[PDB]
Amino acid sequence: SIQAEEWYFGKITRRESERLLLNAENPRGTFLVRESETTKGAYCLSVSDFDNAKGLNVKHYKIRKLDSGGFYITSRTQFNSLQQLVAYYSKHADGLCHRLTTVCPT
Ligand SMILES: *C(=O)c1cc(/C=C(\NC(C)=O)C(=O)N[C@H]2CCCCN(Cc3ccc(-c4ccccc4)cc3)C2=O)ccc1CC(=O)O
């Protein structure tokens, strides 16, 4: 159950996710998964980043869940569960701003 996942922040807003991620103590890849504010049944993976151009910043990726069962950010790379998707992106940056590292502090 994703509700049981410590990285699943459920119903928190985009602004709140940014308030939490925009902490100078957060290394690149600090993340959380929350419900999308506007797309029923989709989620957002909010991730912190840092570079010398933008400084500390946050990116949000839409995670889709099909009624067919799969979870994905890009349809070409799907997962059997949100947990597997999180595990995969913690090892591969692929198209993300950074690989997922640690769960965002509350
Ligand atoms: C949550 O569902 C959510 C997410 C978004 C996402 C974006 N909109 C805004 C205003 O932030 C968005 O544009 N995100 C960027 C992120 C940075 C990368 C550029 N792209 C296109 C893209 C996305 C992902 C990948 C990729 C990822 C992993 C592997 C392979 C490829 C490539 C290219 C973005 O989408 C907007 C709204 C919401 C709903 C909410 O905030 O509540």
Swiss-Prot record:
Disease: SRC kinase activity has been shown to be increased in several tumor tissues and tumor cell lines such as colon carcinoma cells. Thrombocytopenia 6: A form of thrombocytopenia, a hematologic disorder defined by a decrease in the number of platelets in circulating blood, resulting in the potential for increased bleeding and decreased ability for clotting. THC6 is an autosomal dominant form. Affected individuals may also have bone abnormalities and an increased risk for myelofibrosis.
Highest taxon listed in the record's lineage: Eukaryota
Origin species: Homo sapiens
Domain SH2, chain residue ranges per copy: 7-104
Name of the protein this chain belongs to: Proto-oncogene tyrosine-protein kinase Src
Tissues expressing the protein: Expressed ubiquitously. Expressed in the skin (at protein level). Platelets, neurons and osteoclasts express 5-fold to 200-fold higher levels than most other tissues.
Record PTM text: The phosphorylated form is termed pp60c-src. S-nitrosylation is important for activation of its kinase activity.
Phosphotyrosine modified-residue sites: Y43
Entry comment, domain topic: The SH2 and SH3 domains are important for the intramolecular and intermolecular interactions that regulate catalytic activity, localization, and substrate recruitment.
Organism lineage string: Eukaryota, Metazoa, Chordata, Craniata, Vertebrata
Protein family (similarity comment): Belongs to the protein kinase superfamily. Tyr protein kinase family. SRC subfamily.
Subunit details: Part of a complex comprised of PTPRA, BCAR1, BCAR3 (via SH2 domain) and SRC; the formation of the complex is dependent on integrin mediated-tyrosine phosphorylation of PTPRA. Interacts with DDEF1/ASAP1; via the SH3 domain. Interacts with CCPG1. Identified in a complex containing FGFR4, NCAM1, CDH2, PLCG1, FRS2, SRC, SHC1, GAP43 and CTTN. Interacts with ERBB2, STAT1 and PNN. Interacts with DDR1, DDR2 and DAB2. Interacts with CDCP1, TGFB1I1 and TOM1L2. Interacts with the cytoplasmic domain of MUC1, phosphorylates it and increases binding of MUC1 with beta-catenin.
